[PDB]
Amino acid sequence: RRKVCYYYDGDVGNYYYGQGHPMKPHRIRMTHNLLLNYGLYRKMEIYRPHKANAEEMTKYHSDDYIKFLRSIRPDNMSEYSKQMQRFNVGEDCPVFDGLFEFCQLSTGGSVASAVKLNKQQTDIAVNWAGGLHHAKKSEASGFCYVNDIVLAILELLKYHQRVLYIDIDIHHGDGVEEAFYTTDRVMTVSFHKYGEYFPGTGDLRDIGAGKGKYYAVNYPLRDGIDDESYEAIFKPVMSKVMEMFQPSAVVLQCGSDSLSGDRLGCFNLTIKGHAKCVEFVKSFNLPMLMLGGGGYTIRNVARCWTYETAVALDTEIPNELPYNDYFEYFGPDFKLHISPSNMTNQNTNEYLEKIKQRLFENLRMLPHA
Amino acid sequence: MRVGPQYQAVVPDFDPAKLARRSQERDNLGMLVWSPNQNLSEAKLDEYIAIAKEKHGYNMEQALGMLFWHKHNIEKSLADLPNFTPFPDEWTVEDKVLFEQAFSFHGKTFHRIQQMLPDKSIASLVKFYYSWKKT
Amino acid sequence: SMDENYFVNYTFKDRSHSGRVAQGIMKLCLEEELFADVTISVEGREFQLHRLVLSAQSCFFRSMFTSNLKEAHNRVIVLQDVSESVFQLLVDYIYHGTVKLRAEELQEIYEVSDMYQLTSLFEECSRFLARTVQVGNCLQVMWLADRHSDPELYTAAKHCAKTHLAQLQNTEEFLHLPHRLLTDIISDGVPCSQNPTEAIEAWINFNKEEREAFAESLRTSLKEIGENVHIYLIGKESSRTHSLAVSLHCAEDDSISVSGQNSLCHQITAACKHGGDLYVVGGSTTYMLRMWKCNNATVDWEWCAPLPRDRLQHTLVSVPGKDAIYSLGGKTLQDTLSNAVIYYRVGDNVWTETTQLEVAVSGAAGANLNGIIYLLGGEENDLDFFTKPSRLIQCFDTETDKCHVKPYVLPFAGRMHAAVHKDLVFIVAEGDSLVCYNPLLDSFTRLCLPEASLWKIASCNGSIYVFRDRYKKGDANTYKLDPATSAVTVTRGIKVLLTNLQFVLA
Amino acid sequence: PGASMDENYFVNYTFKDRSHSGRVAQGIMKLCLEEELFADVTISVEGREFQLHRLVLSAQSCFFRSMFTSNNRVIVLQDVSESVFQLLVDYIYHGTVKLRAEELQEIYEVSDMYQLTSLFEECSRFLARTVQVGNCLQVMWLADRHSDPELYTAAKHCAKTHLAQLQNTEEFLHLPHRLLTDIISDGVPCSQNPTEAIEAWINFNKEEREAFAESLRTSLKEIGENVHIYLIGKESSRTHSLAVSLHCAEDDSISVSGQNSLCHQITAACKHGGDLYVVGYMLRMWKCNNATVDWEWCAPLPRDRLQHTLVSVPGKDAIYSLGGKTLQDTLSNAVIYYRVGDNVWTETTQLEVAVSGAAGANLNGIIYLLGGEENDLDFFTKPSRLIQCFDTETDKCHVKPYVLPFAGRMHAAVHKDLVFIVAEGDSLVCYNPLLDSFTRLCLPESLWKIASCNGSIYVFRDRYKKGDANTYKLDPATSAVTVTRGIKVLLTNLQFVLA
Ligand SMILES: O=P(O)(O)O[C@H]1[C@H](OP(=O)(O)O)[C@@H](OP(=O)(O)O)[C@H](OP(=O)(O)O)[C@@H](OP(=O)(O)O)[C@H]1OP(=O)(O)O
Ligand SMILES: [Zn+2]
């Protein structure tokens, strides 16, 4: 019995990055369509985001960067040369028809979601378009142009004393951990995969620099981590973070990019694992903000996210997929839950124990709230 | 991780004096296209949508938006079903066939597909492509 | 230890002992002819030899000397079926340890070695017969590695007779070949281009008075295999921006053709050829996890599982010794040199991490010898946190998983391309000088090439093709050397010419 | 390794068998001294018959290859024992002899007569490893008859160090003048009164050996006494630490010789030649000027590390610093050094695998970096067992293909040719790097340190229950662990013992 809102503009799945690029925003639409057939939209306040004007996109990012994103187009690429080689935009984050409207849309949804969230209207705020956690203050990085999460948290810090951030994605949210690397109001807990891997940062030793020391949890993992291990390491650490830090609002970046088989994955989770994660985080009775970001096998992202929204509400949903518009994309079984693969996990228990004890040792040194 | 002035975000420090009055200085951001209701039983909604698909061209969503357009009154929306139409953006013979020529003599450079479908933009080309790969 | 007390008593073991006895015998023995006690006379020569070194080296002389016969403590011995020009090499081997092997007088030594139970020289004459196995002496080396009970040289001498059965049907040796041998060369997988049906029928029609009711189980045992005579050229065409994946199906000899094409929208940071299937790795973006798999009979790209690491200029090695694609070394995202080994079970689409290298390299030329991956040169971590051209040799052992740098180094250094051939590793780098590397003997031999710039090696089936990158049209931009005569000829027929070779695979 | 160009692996090349020397070695080892076949010559020792081969005896030695080629009987050797020539045969054939202290000197004779080079050299190493005051003036004579410089020095150091204890024996009585000149004219410490022992030697004959007497008193090099075994220890409530020195007495007794409480905070320290160099805010260095009490200043480190290992090298007159943590818990592997006089730190090659808190010990050149703790899986550290030799001259560091019988934090003491390692209790390993082996002892019974004064191994218990005198004197020949004293200090928790 908890009110749930949902942000989705029927126009985000038309922005196409390039030919042969891992991120295809179309997955959002597919997710939407499943939510339109499971029966999970009768009972969820559906909104439409506002096109985020470039005057709130500046309260974090620099001005020349936003002017660059607003003034670039694949026809006049030759005119802006040193500009695009200085803002990283061009090779990993390609220019494409749209771009700044995509950023307006994701950022508008996330920021508006926080604005409604801190006014004690709804309790859970869903937005699977935003959550771009690699973008930085004056440059793009890792498929991400603007950093929706830091704008949403900059919006939440107007009414809340302390804000928690949770990273489930395979990668290290280095943009939102960097943006809050000195302050101690926001605490960034990030479970990731640290070996030689994107983005490279995210060690166990880099914590906080300045006032916000001991206020940045990085949990480095290894390949092939199955579900039971990820639960046994997710529950205690987050109970300790809730006990020691005492937040007021939670921002979950439920990245569906750590499942069984992605174009770019490496773990070995399943959908019910992420479901248990979002249910555990949901069971603290705090203003919660679910985001997206990450996930490059489209059908598994749609399945994962639609079962996530099935967890946010309360309703159980069957395995059989009802008639949508994309059966030609879902495999020859037409079932929701996927199964793990054959990959073995190289994090041998006592690894998780030593890391976890290091984390507890770093968490017992926070002052009272 | 980098530390400096142009790397981190400038967090505003906390003064409780502003946790009350701003609650109306920034209104609701975004349209409200649908909201649940306790009065209308979802059986009449299942019938409403089944009629909106069988007896009319609406789908599994525009029936809900149009139902909210009249403040949860089924009969009025039923009265306004023949008025508005589900805009049939019909890609006719020349449209689909020329699109197949662009996709068979070009690929996924929709900017080039635009150089033989100059009337349509790009969002409708991409929207038609994902709904076209089914063949 | 518990009783050995270095101030009371202990067991001094001298480990420089084995060389002082050997260099004692090869210098005091075969020089001053001192202390001789047996005379081995062969085809008219008296040899003043010792019984202690001949017996401590070959059990044949151990059983011939310590015997109950009459010629035990007499003196002169007269050996039979051996010449006085081979037994001198046997003396130069027993007393010294260094023999000068030549392809002229080889089989004889082989035979004689097997009669004297000199195991090491027999194994090296067997490997050196496995190298120089022609198409003419392929039914005589087969018939020779059979009366000596040798499975290695029999398999090597049978593969060539199998993959050259077309131009072997009319030879008068293939008509006298007995039933077991033909059963072995047929029941193995003769290609369709080698038309085996009319080969067996051509065999039966000889002494059919006694062979008709004796050669039908042969036809019930005939097989057929696909085509693994490929090159797989991957280079960026001068026209568009995508890179083709040309497949070169070589004919019989002195001609290479072209099968089909595929192209790819992505870039490539590494690529390998596993069992006739193509495996490319990398993406034009900054997530170079991705990996694809191509084949001439699908014109598709069956995506495979992504790597667990983001490295470029790493080293993909293959060879189905146990079905796995290895990725050794590489240069990371922040321009650091990694030294981690990850492998890929092709039958499972699963990557796994094994023991790491001892020196981090990037761009090393890897070559798999029957279950051992060799990392050759590449690029090494300098000292001022820079890089430098490397000379190292590394020997990852894909059976016990244990790599270790070889003590010696290469002649040249830097960016090199190498291909395995028969038993050796042909390496090319700084312009025009290919060295053939023998990892068993730990030695090199140069060869020199035309003076007219990079080069790429691909040992196709029987020969060694040498493709030069910059197709400047004027040059014949493709060669073919015979490693026994160093005769660099010119082969033609590239048809769909490229312009910038990135990878020339096996 | 050589890129030959005359030979071709497909036409003509040269074969080079690697397992040849071995195969012939175990060939002669096997079918000779087991079945006794092809017996050639017969050698008679005392009254025992030895059926031996001429090719092996001629291969190993030159005495025999010159005896057999003298251009047909049982040749008899007239000055060897029946039980020593057996060791000589078991060495010439098998190459693995069982040494022993009772029939050692005998071998030193015969192994030189037969010109067995390796057995003579190692017999010399094991003969100079166990020279005591009882037999130094005889091992000098033995080293002088056979023209051995290495063992003459090791036999002369013990003779001039303990000079007062010998000035009234009898081996010192009939001593030739050349040996005495070699003893006194190299640096006799003043603690044994060299001036009186000269005239004491003169009165043994008085009338004859007096022609050079006055000129013999103008030949010695009397030198002041140094200092042994530093104890930088933390005693009493705070008060920093100390720097207690221990003047050694040749009476099974150690003595204190002035403290030096002037300390701040120490991370590491080492003893060079005869003074203390200390490092400890974390990259400085002071010197212990004990003659004038005061410390002194030196150059700082080019970097900053924690728990690094300082190894003193009097050969090159330098100090190497190896390994250690770098503030943040990441293990480093950078070897630096400090030249005394030039007073400028520099840099050398890096270690193979990084390690911190190890125990370094140099053997006349090569520095052995023992134990420590190496990083593991995946961010942390584990107690290692690795052995590393850092060749101080060629600048080559490489790991030994074997590990210790224990792991963790340990303390080592160079003694003679051996390295006495000790660690976490009921253990005392005696590592010999030349022939690559370990020999464990047994100790009475808590970490404890080890130190080598001159001819004994003083082992120190670094923790007291106040009133126990846990400063054991270890004689490793008989594993005799005694309890010495004479120390008059209340030093409680001592950090480390600088030998
Ligand atoms: O599974 P693959 O053989 O690697 O093919 C994929 C897959 O295409 P299919 O429709 O044939 O499965 C992607 O489709 P979705 O997973 O997104 O449905 C498609 O992406 P888009 O068509 O949506 O762009 C992508 O194409 P691209 O590489 O151009 O992004 C294409 O890859 P290939 O080009 O390797 O076939
Ligand atoms: Zn991700």
Side-chain angles (χ1 to χ4, degrees), chain D residues 272-290:
Chain D
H272 187 193
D275 60 358
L276 188 152
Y277 293 167
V278 66
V279 173
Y281 63 94
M282 287 298 293
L283 56 88
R284 275 72 172 175
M285 179 180 283
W286 292 274
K287 185 262 285 181
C288 183
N289 192 359
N290 59 5

Side-chain angles (χ1 to χ4, degrees), chain A residues 4 7-8 10-11 13-16 18-20 24-26 29 32 36-37 41-50 56 59-60 75 97 108 111-113 115-116 119 121 136-139 150 154-155 157-161 172 174-175 177-183 185-186 201-202 206 209 211 325-326 328-329, chain B residues 1-16 18-37 42 45-47 49-50 53 59-65 68 72 103 106-112 114 122-135:
Chain A
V4 177
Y7 285 93
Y8 175 73
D11 198 3
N14 293 321
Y15 297 99
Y16 183 74
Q19 186 179 3
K24 301 296 192 293
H26 180 75
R29 292 181 68 189
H32 180 73
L36 190 65
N37 293 115
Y41 68 98
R42 284 89 157 91
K43 59 182 73 65
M44 181 174 69
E45 292 181 354
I46 298 170
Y47 292 171
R48 301 292 182 184
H50 64 88
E56 69 181 1
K59 67 183 181 181
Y60 172 70
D75 61 357
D97 287 324
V111 173
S113 181
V115 172
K116 178 176 65 65
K119 293 184 184 293
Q121 291 182 357
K136 296 178 176 65
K137 184 175 175 67
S138 179
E139 65 182 1
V150 175
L154 264 292
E155 183 66 28
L157 294 175
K158 291 171 69 175
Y159 286 165
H160 294 285
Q161 177 69 43
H172 176 268
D174 58 356
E177 180 173 358
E178 183 177 1
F180 297 100
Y181 191 74
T182 301
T183 185
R185 295 181 68 189
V186 180
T201 60
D206 52 354
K211 181 177 73 174
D325 293 332
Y326 298 102
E328 293 84 6
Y329 291 166
Chain B
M1 290 295 102
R2 294 173 292 175
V3 175
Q6 71 273 16
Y7 294 101
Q8 286 80 18
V10 178
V11 295
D13 288 331
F14 187 77
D15 190 359
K18 291 181 180 180
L19 276 70
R21 184 174 291 172
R22 288 180 176 177
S23 66
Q24 293 180 356
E25 292 181 353
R26 189 173 180 178
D27 293 331
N28 289 318
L29 295 174
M31 285 76 75
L32 194 153
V33 298
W34 177 253
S35 178
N37 191 359
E42 292 181 354
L45 276 73
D46 290 331
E47 183 179 1
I49 300 164
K53 289 183 179 180
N59 58 6
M60 196 71 200
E61 181 180 1
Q62 293 179 356
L64 278 300
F68 181 76
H72 292 89
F103 182 74
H106 292 284
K108 290 182 181 180
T109 303
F110 293 100
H111 181 74
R112 290 181 181 177
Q114 186 177 2
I122 297 168
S124 181
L125 293 174
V126 176
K127 186 176 180 180
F128 178 75
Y129 179 72
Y130 287 99
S131 180
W132 180 69
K133 290 173 68 177
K134 295 180 182 180
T135 62

Side-chain angles (χ1 to χ4, degrees), chain A residues 124-128 252-254 278 288-292 308-309 312:
Chain A
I124 298 170
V126 180
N127 185 0
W128 302 110
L252 181 64
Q253 194 270 329
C254 183
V278 68
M288 186 177 179
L289 176 62
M290 290 186 287
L291 296 171
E308 294 289 323
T309 304

Side-chain angles (χ1 to χ4, degrees), chain C residues 1-29 34-37 50-53 55-57 61-62 65-66 93-104 120-121 124 127-128 131-132 358 383 385 408-411 421-422 424 426 435-438 440-448 464 483-486, chain D residues 1-32 37-40 53-56 58-61 64-65 68-69 91-102 118-119 122 125-126 129-130 349-350 352 415-416 418 420 430-441 457 475-479:
Chain C
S1 297
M2 73 291 291
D3 196 0
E4 295 180 355
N5 193 1
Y6 288 159
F7 294 177
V8 174
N9 58 3
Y10 63 101
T11 300
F12 172 68
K13 181 179 182 293
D14 191 359
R15 63 183 180 271
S16 177
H17 185 273
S18 295
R20 185 172 62 247
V21 178
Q23 278 72 242
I25 295 170
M26 68 181 72
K27 182 261 289 181
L28 187 147
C29 178
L34 293 173
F35 303 108
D37 60 357
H50 295 86
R51 293 182 292 172
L52 186 63
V53 183
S55 178
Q57 187 64 255
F61 290 103
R62 184 182 295 116
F65 290 157
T66 63
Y93 178 75
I94 293 170
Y95 287 172
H96 292 171
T98 66
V99 65
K100 185 70 181 294
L101 292 171
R102 290 185 291 113
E104 292 84 5
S120 296
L121 184 61
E124 181 63 27
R127 291 193 295 270
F128 180 62
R131 293 182 183 95
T132 179
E358 292 181 353
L383 183 62
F385 291 165
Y408 55 91
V409 297
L410 292 173
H421 187 271
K422 298 291 185 182
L424 303 176
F426 288 90
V435 297
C436 66
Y437 166 66
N438 196 358
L440 275 298
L441 296 175
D442 289 331
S443 296
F444 304 155
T445 56
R446 291 182 184 272
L447 194 150
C448 294
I464 301 166
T485 62
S486 297
Chain D
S4 64
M5 295 178 71
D6 185 74
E7 64 188 4
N8 191 359
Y9 289 98
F10 295 95
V11 173
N12 185 0
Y13 70 97
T14 302
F15 178 67
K16 184 71 179 294
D17 194 0
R18 283 81 63 198
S19 178
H20 180 75
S21 65
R23 183 173 61 246
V24 66
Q26 290 96 25
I28 294 169
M29 183 185 291
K30 182 174 72 68
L31 60 87
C32 175
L37 293 172
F38 304 103
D40 193 359
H53 296 175
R54 295 185 293 172
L55 184 62
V56 182
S58 296
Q60 290 295 107
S61 66
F64 289 106
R65 77 179 69 186
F68 294 110
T69 63
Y91 177 75
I92 292 168
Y93 288 167
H94 292 171
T96 300
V97 63
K98 181 72 175 177
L99 293 172
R100 192 174 301 278
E102 64 182 2
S118 296
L119 186 62
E122 193 277 334
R125 289 195 293 269
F126 173 64
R129 189 185 296 119
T130 179
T349 187
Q350 293 180 356
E352 290 292 327
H415 188 272
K416 303 294 182 182
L418 302 170
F420 287 93
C430 181
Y431 172 64
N432 191 358
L434 273 298
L435 58 88
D436 292 329
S437 69
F438 300 94
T439 60
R440 292 176 63 88
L441 281 74
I457 299 170
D475 190 359
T478 62
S479 296

